[PDB]
Amino acid sequence: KCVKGCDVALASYYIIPSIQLRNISNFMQSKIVLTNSFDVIMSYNRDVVFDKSGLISYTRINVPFPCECIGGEFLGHVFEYTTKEGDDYDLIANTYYASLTTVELLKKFNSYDPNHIPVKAKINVTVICSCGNSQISKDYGLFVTYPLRSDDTLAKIATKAGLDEGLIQNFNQDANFSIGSGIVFIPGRDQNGHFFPLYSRTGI
């Protein structure tokens, strides 16, 4: 249950061949990610290296998005995607949105026949998020929505994040980080590389 969300969450977007920033920007348009979003997206990815093509296949980039309370029930954000010929919920969930949504969420929040979705149709694409949990730690107020994949492990995730494995597990107590699917929440760094805390400790 929720009443309010938070201004920013990060979506861990796993890059496959044929996906570049222009596609990610199109899929992830929001009040934060506008038509010309390169600087805003890349400001949360100052660690990321490009190759001659742009984004390197099979790496991740963190995409900022607003985190709303949906129906007083759960935290997430509804993106909008317009279908093209051949699209189905599998392609939308697991290719375009890189498993940041699920076929179940696409069925739940769209009126289309889930087995025959039309072309040039607007799709509500729900991506969950977190604004933290003071019972785990007060030190983190920005979270990455991180869909696990076949080669992920807790050890690699924790090392890359610069955080203790036990803390990451504590934020996701029921998750098996080696299971190869499902979403976990990882504390995220701001544009300066610092962990934005749950409660502000900067002077006004």
Ligand X SMILES: *[C@@H]1O[C@H](CO)[C@@H](O[C@@H]2O[C@H](CO)[C@@H](O)[C@H](O)[C@H]2NC(C)=O)[C@H](O)[C@H]1NC(C)=O
Ligand Y SMILES: *[C@@H]1O[C@H](CO[C@@H]2O[C@@H](C)[C@@H](O)[C@@H](O)[C@@H]2O)[C@@H](O)[C@H](O)[C@H]1NC(C)=O
Ligand Z SMILES: *[C@@H]1O[C@H](CO)[C@@H](O[C@@H]2O[C@H](CO)[C@@H](O[C@@H]3O[C@H](CO)[C@@H](O)[C@H](O)[C@@H]3O)[C@H](O)[C@H]2NC(C)=O)[C@H](O)[C@H]1NC(C)=O
Please list, residue by residue across 87-114, b when 16 or more beta carbons sit within 10 angstroms of its beta carbon and e when fewer do.
Answer: bebeebbbebbbbbbbeebbeeebeeee
Which C-beta is closer to ligand X: that of 51 or that of 113?
A: 113
> DSSP string covering 80-133, please?
EEE--TT--HHIIIIIITTTSS-HHHHHHT--S-TTSPPTT-EEEEEEE----B
Q: Which of 11, 9, 13 is nearest to 68 (CA)?
A: 9
Q: How far is the CB of 178 from ligand Y (least distance, A)?
A: 4
Which C-beta is closer to ligand Y: that of 181 or that of 191?
A: 181
Binder of residue 178, out of ligand Z, ligand Y, ligand X, none (CB less than 5 to 8 A by kind): ligand Y
Q: How far is the CB of 109 from ligand X (least distance, A)?
A: 6
d(CA 173, CA 128): 17
Residues 78-117 that bind ligand X (CB under 6 A): 78, 109-112
Which C-beta is closer to ligand X: that of 122 or that of 138?
A: 122
Residues 70-89 that bind ligand Y (CB under 6 A): none
Is there binding between residue 94 and ligand Z (CB under 6 A)? no
Q: Which secondary-structure segment (H or E) carries 146?
A: strand 143-147
Interface residues with ligand Z (CB under 6 A) are 22-23
Binding site for ligand X (CB under 6 A): 78, 109-112, 124
Residues that bind ligand Y (CB under 6 A): 176, 178-180
